Structure 1
Amino acid sequence: NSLALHKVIMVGSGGVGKSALTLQFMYDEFVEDYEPTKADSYRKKVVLDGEEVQIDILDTAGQEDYAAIRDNYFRSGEGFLCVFSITEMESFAATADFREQILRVKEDENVPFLLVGNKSDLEDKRQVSVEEAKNRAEQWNVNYVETSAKTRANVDKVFFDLMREIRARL
C-alpha cells in the first residue's frame, strides 16, 4: 500500500538552476523567471526501475538564514542534488559549503549526493572545467553529472540516479 518516498533536496548558490532543473523534471518546461527567493516542495509519482515510488523535491531558495532551521530542513532530506553553474566559478566553489552543511547534519559521508554542473548548453561561457569538477567529485566519492535545464540533458538522470542512491543506501 505504502510507496517508497524519496526525499530530495536541491541545494546550491543563486541562479545555478535549482528551480529550472526542478521544474523541467516536474512539468517538462524550461522556466527562466522563477522568483529567486521562492522555495517550494514538489511531489510526483515516478516509476523507478519498474517500481512505483514517490519523489519529494525541496527546491531551496536560500532564504532560510536561521541555522537551526536550515539544518532541520537538511535533516529531513534523504538525498541531495548539489548544483552549481558551469558558467560561474564562485558557484562551484560554494558547493563545498553545502557539502559541509549536509555532512554536519547527516553525519554520513555516503549520504546520497550528486554534484551537478548545470548549464551545459553554455559551453562557450564555461568557467568550471569538467576536469576540476570531476576531481572534486572524486575527492568526495560522489558522481558528477552535467545537466542542462534548457535542453533537458541529464535532468531525469540526476533525479533518478539520486533516487537509486537513496534506495540502495537507506
Structure 2
Amino acid sequence: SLALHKVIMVGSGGVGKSALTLQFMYDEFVEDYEPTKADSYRKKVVLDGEEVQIDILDTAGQEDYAAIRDNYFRSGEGFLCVFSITEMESFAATADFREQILRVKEDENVPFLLVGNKSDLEDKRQVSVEEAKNRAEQWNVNYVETSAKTRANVDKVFFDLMREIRARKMEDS
C-alpha cells in the first residue's frame, strides 16, 4: 500500500551503476570487478518524511542489449543515466541511452538525472563539469556528480529522482 518508485540505472560498463546502488542500499563500497546482467533491489526509505518503497533495476553496461533494454526501460518510472567523469567514452554513450529511453517511454519529460560518477578521482577526470552541465541543460534534466566511494551526493540522486517520479504521479492522479 506504500508508494513504489521504480528507478532504473543505465550507463556504460564500469561507470559505477552497481557501486552507487550498493552504497545506497547497503552502505558499502568495495573495489571489485563484477559485470552486471540485471539485478533487482527494493527497500523502504523515507522520502521527505513519508515512508515509501524504492525499487532499483541495476542493468548491464554492455551495449549487447537491444530489445532487452526496451522491456527493462518500459518497466521503469525514473532513470539515473550514469557515466564516469574519468571516462569520456562513457559520457558520449549517454546520448544513446537517453535516445533509447525516451523512445520506449514515449515521454521527453520522463524523470531523468544525468549522473557523473567517480567524483573522488578528480586527478583522472576526462569529462569537464561544464561539458556535462551543458548536456544536462540541453536535455532539460539536472546534473549531479557523485562518488560511490565517499558517497557524496549518492543519496541525493536517488531522492531527487524519486521526487520527480513523485511529482509526475501527482499530475497524472
Assess, with a 3 A threshold, how the Cα gap between structure 1 residues 18 and 66 changes in structure 2: closer, same or farther.
closer
**1:69: how far off?**
2.5
Report the Cα distance in structure 1 between the residues aligned to 2:112 and 2:61, rounded to whole angstroms.
Answer: 18
- TM-score normalised to the size of structure 1? 0.95
**1:65: how far off?**
3.9
Assess, with a 3 A threshold, how the Cα gap between structure 1 residues 88 and 63 changes in structure 2: closer, same or farther.
closer
Deviation string 1:93-141 (CA, Å, 9 cap, x unpaired) is 0000000000011111110000000000011100000000000000000
- TM-score normalised to the size of structure 2? 0.94
Spell out structure 1 runs of 4+ moving beyond 3 A: 62-66
1:117/1:147 contact within 8 Å kept = yes
Counterpart secondary structure, 2:152: coil
2:11/2:94 contact within 8 Å kept = yes
CA RMSD in angstroms comes to 1.2
How many residue pairs get aligned? The number is 168
**1:33: how far off?**
1.4
1:24/1:31 contact within 8 Å kept = no
Assess, with a 3 A threshold, how the Cα gap between structure 1 residues 125 and 63 changes in structure 2: closer, same or farther.
closer
Assess, with a 3 A threshold, how the Cα gap between structure 1 residues 34 and 58 changes in structure 2: closer, same or farther.
farther
Percent of residue pairs bearing the same amino acid type = 100
Deviation string 1:42-86 (CA, Å, 9 cap, x unpaired) is 001001001111000001024684533320110000000000000
Assess, with a 3 A threshold, how the Cα gap between structure 1 residues 127 and 147 changes in structure 2: closer, same or farther.
same
Report the Cα distance in structure 1 between the residues aligned to 2:101 and 2:15, rounded to whole angstroms.
Answer: 18
The 5-angstrom pairing of residues 63-74 of structure 1 reads 65-74=64-73
2:14/2:61 contact within 8 Å kept = no
Deviation string 1:10-57 (CA, Å, 9 cap, x unpaired) is 000000000000000000000321511342110010010011110000
Assess, with a 3 A threshold, how the Cα gap between structure 1 residues 24 and 98 changes in structure 2: closer, same or farther.
same
2:15/2:84 contact within 8 Å kept = yes
Assess, with a 3 A threshold, how the Cα gap between structure 1 residues 4 and 115 changes in structure 2: closer, same or farther.
same
2:116/2:144 contact within 8 Å kept = yes
Counterpart secondary structure, 1:62: coil
For structure 2, which runs of at least 5 residues remain unmatched after alignment? Answer: 169-173
